[PDB]
Amino acid sequence: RKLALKAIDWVAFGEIIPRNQKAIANSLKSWNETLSTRLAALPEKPPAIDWAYYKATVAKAGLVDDFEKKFNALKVPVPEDKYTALVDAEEQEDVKRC
Amino acid sequence: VQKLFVDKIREYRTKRQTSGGPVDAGPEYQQDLDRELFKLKQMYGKADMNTFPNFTFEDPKFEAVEKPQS
Amino acid sequence: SVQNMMRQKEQEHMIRWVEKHVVQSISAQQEKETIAKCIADLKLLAKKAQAQ
Amino acid sequence: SSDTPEGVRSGAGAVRDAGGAFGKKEQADEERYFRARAREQLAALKKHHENEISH
Amino acid sequence: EVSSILEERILGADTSVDLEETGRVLSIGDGIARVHGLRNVQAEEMVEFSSGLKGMSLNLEPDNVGVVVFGNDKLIKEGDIVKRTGAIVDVPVGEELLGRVVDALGNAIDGKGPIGSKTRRRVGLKAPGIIPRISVREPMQTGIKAVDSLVPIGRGQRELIIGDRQTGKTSIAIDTIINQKRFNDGTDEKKKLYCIYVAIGQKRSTVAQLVKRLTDADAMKYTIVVSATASDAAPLQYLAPYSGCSMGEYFRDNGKHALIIYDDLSKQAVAYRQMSLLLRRPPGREAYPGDVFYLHSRLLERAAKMNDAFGGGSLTALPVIETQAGDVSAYIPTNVISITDGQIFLETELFYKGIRPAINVGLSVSRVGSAAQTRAMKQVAGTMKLELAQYREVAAFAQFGSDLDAATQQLLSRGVRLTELLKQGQYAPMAIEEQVAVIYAGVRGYLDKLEPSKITKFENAFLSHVISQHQALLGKIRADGKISEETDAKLKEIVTNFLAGFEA
Numbered sequence: 001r002k003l004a005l006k007a008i009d010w011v012a013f014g015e016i017i018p019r020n021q022k023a024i025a026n027s028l029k030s031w032n033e034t035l036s037t038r039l040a041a042l043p044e045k046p047p048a049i050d051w052a053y054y055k056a057t058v059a060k061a062g063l064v065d066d067f068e069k070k071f072n073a074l075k076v077p078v079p080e081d082k083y084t085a086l087v088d089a090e091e092q093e094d095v096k097r098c
Numbered sequence: 099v100q101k102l103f104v105d106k107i108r109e110y111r112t113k114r115q116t117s118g119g120p121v122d123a124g125p126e127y128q129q130d131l132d133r134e135l136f137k138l139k140q141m142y143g144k145a146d147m148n149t150f151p152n153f154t155f156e157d158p159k160f161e162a163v164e165k166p167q168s
Numbered sequence: 169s170v171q172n173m174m175r176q177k178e179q180e181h182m183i184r185w186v187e188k189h190v191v192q193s194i195s196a197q198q199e200k201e202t203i204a205k206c207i208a209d210l211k212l213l214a215k216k217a218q219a220q
Numbered sequence: 221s222s223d224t225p226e227g228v229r230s231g232a233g234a235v236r237d238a239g240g241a242f243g244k245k246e247q248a249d250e251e252r253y254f255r256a257r258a259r260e261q262l263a264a265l266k267k268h269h270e271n272e273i274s275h
Numbered sequence: 276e277v278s279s280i281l282e283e284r285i286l287g288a289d290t291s292v293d294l295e296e297t298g299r300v301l302s303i304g305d306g307i308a309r310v311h312g313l314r315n316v317q318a319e320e321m322v323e324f325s326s327g328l329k330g331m332s333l334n335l336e337p338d339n340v341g342v343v344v345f346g347n348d349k350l351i352k353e354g355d356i357v358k359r360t361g362a363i364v365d366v367p368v369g370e371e372l373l374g375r376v377v378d379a380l381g382n383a384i385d386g387k388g389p390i391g392s393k394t395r396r397r398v399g400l401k402a403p404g405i406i407p408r409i410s411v412r413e414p415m416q417t418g419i420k421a422v423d424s425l426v427p428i429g430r431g432q433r434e435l436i437i438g439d440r441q442t443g444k445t446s447i448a449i450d451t452i453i454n455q456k457r458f459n460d461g462t463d464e465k466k467k468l469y470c471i472y473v474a475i476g477q478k479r480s481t482v483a484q485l486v487k488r489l490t491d492a493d494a495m496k497y498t499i500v501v502s503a504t505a506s507d508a509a510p511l512q513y514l515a516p517y518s519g520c521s522m523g524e525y526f527r528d529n530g531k532h533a534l535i536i537y538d539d540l541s542k543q544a545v546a547y548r549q550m551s552l553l554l555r556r557p558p559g560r561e562a563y564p565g566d567v568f569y570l571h572s573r574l575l576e577r578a579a580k581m582n583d584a585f586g587g588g589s590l591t592a593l594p595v596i597e598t599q600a601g602d603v604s605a606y607i608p609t610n611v612i613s614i615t616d617g618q619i620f621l622e623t624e625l626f627y628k629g630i631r632p633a634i635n636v637g638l639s640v641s642r643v644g645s646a647a648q649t650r651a652m653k654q655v656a657g658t659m660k661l662e663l664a665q666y667r668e669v670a671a672f673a674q675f676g677s678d679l680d681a682a683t684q685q686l687l688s689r690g691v692r693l694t695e696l697l698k699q700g701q702y703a704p705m706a707i708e709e710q711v712a713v714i715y716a717g718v719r720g721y722l723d724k725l726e727p728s729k730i731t732k733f734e735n736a737f738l739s740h741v742i743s744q745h746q747a748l749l750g751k752i753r754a755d756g757k758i759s760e761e762t763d764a765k766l767k768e769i770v771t772n773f774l775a776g777f778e779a
């Protein structure tokens with residue numbers, strides 16, 4: 001899999017200082033603690049699919065193996081990254097204003 | 099007791115010779131295990147015999163806000 | 169869960185036929201009773217030599 | 221007695237379960253006090269103005 | 276291939292003839308057979324009747340022998356034949372029983388298959404003496420914040436769970452089975468634990484709900500359950516405590532560790548009283564026989580901490596005892612109190628006042644003391660035990676107190692907030708490194724300004740923080756065992772950083 005690190009969420013990242021908007025900065029740290037535990041719930045690799053024991057234990061053949069032939073060569077397309085760029089776009093304009 | 103033993107082995111092989119399946123069960127064992135599995139498959143799940151599952155999921159729209167500083 | 173559950177249904181129905189069918193088959197074997205006495209005592213002849 | 225697990229110890233709500241003098245003095249004091257609060261809460265409940273227009 | 280395995284068994288069966296030492300039946304009634312004959316039976320020897328039931332001969336009288344029946348007496352007619360087996364009662368034992376449901380005699384009731392155990396063991400063995408024992412030092416982790424703080428349990432101690440009906444006596448002994456999953460899937464061989472659970476006279480539907488609770492938490496691959504239910508005969512609820520120690524002594528004899536739970540021992544003294552008064556034995560106080568102390572003593576003395584010359588094994592015993600109206604001064608609640616080491620006294624008043632688990636720490640003791648706590652837990656809980664004990668002196672001033680000294684207002688202020696740390700939901704057992712951090716947040720003084728209703732919400736927020744963002748500190752209290760000066764400062768800014776921005 002792939003996993004990149006981050007910076008320290010210690011002093012600055014919870015003190016964004018909006019117009020008395022400490023609640024929006026508090027919600028920003030609350031998403032990092034939730035997703036890091038959901039990443040700690042499941043590993044990077046899933047379980048392995050034993051194919052040889054499937055043929056003998058489910059030995060009524062045809063209908064068992066045809067689903068196991070179609071679901072084996074499938075693909076899982078992850079969601080889009082369209083909102084990933086526009087949120088990073090407003091950081092470029094505000095850093096020029098800061 | 100071996101002569102009693104092979105008498106048992108004879109009656110297992112006449113029980114092997116089947117053409118209609120359950121001879122002594124009748125409708126009693128046929129209505130039971132058909133209703134027993136369907137009562138258990140209702141607790142198990144509605145899945146087909148060969149339909150492989152495939153779907154997709156929608157991630158959250160990462161929105162932004164404004165904050166005027168400097 | 170269907171291939172292994174239904175196997176136990178005819179595993180019990182197998183023995184449900186035999187043990188009611190043995191007693192109707194050995195009830196007329198009185199010609200086998202005259203050797204059943206003659207095979208018992210030779211095991212007893214084998215048995216009484218153990219303590220002696 | 222009570223300075224060990226073996227001996228008898230008293231719980232909460234043991235004056236009313238006895239039913240003596242203090243158990244009867246407590247029931248007639250919760251009633252003679254909350255009888256006057258059924259007066260002041262019912263007299264001020266007649267001060268709804270919409271009912272008076274119906275009157 | 277269903278016909279082939281049935282033909283396989285009957286040729287593999289043994290049909291051989293033997294001798295016997297039989298004796299006719301005189302008078303069967305209420306589950307006590309009187310047999311005339313059987314001139315060479317030992318005491319407590321298993322016989323078997325003509326129908327198929329088995330029997331254990333308890334009274335060796337001159338002209339007859341009194342044999343209890345393992346079943347129902349409607350199949351025993353006067354004039355039957357009582358053959359002899361020739362052996363005292365023995366149970367299968369080994370590693371193969373792990374993850375099965377067994378009755379009091381080792382048969383399989385869950386319907387997976389027969390036990391493949393190659394060994395066999397008697398149930399009437401003795402305890403080890405004084406020489407093969409050593410003092411208890413290792414901790415047995417329960418996972419309850421009030422047990423490991425104030426009434427600890429070592430690995431070889433007997434601890435009694437005493438209380439009334441419906442106060443969470445079964446639930447305290449059901450998450451102690453769940454909590455040992457974190458060691459039982461790892462690598463450290465001398466920290467694993469094995470749990471056995473004995474149900475004595477409960478209904479079959481309750482045991483069928485508790486196996487599913489332990490199947491859900493993936494905690495039925497190292498647990499055995501011995502079920503002698505309510506419908507089963509009166510002597511099968513007598514053997515079943517002694518049929519579990521014989522499975523918990525195979526792990527003590529071979530250098531391993533174990534745990535056993537008797538649920539409950541107050542239904543064994545009743546199933547044994549019925550067997551006595553039907554055999555015409557002299558009664559005593561509350562119609563119990565003269566040897567009900569000798570019934571429970573030689574079952575709890577089999578729990579021992581062995582030394583290194585014999586293997587280093589252990590056996591830990593937790594018996595459950597149900598009192599009636601909170602009177603521990605009855606007959607059986609005073610036998611088992613004077614045998615064991617300490618009690619955990621769950622009240623019913625604290626259960627409805629919000630304190631759950633409702634452990635009364637005023638009456639709960641443990642006489643192995645602080646010698647079974649780790650060095651981290653011992654340092655913080657030694658002041659907490661002194662702090663809570665000063666609160667219980669002044670609990671009677673809380674209902675009308677505002678005109679008191681500022682020390683007394685402080686003693687009330689810390690006692691309420693230490694109590695909220697002790698409450699805990701069901702089926703959530705914690706770790707010792709997470710337990711010591713929450714106690715350290717409270718006993719130092721970092722909570723006397725937070726509102727007493729928020730102490731639960733603050734704790735669930737703080738624990739999920741330090742698991743993900745301070746994982747490298749909870750590996751230097753788990754592996755170190757103690758809490759040093761480097762970790763004392765490192766934990767100090769953590770609870771000051773979280774408390775500063777908390778309310779959001």
Ligand SMILES: Nc1ncnc2c1ncn2[C@@H]1O[C@H](COP(=O)(O)OP(=O)(O)OP(=O)(O)O)[C@@H](O)[C@H]1O
Nearest residue numbers: 439440441442443444445446447631632699700701
């Ligand atoms: N920590 C807890 N918090 C809240 N509820 C609990 C807790 N522990 C147990 N309970 C509840 O208490 C109820 C009864 O508990 P439990 O059956 O363990 O008591 P018991 O005295 O062992 O029962 P019995 O009297 O049948 O032996 C259960 O319904 C359970 O949901």
Ligand SMILES: [Mg+2]
Nearest residue numbers: 441444445446
């Ligand atoms: Mg219970």
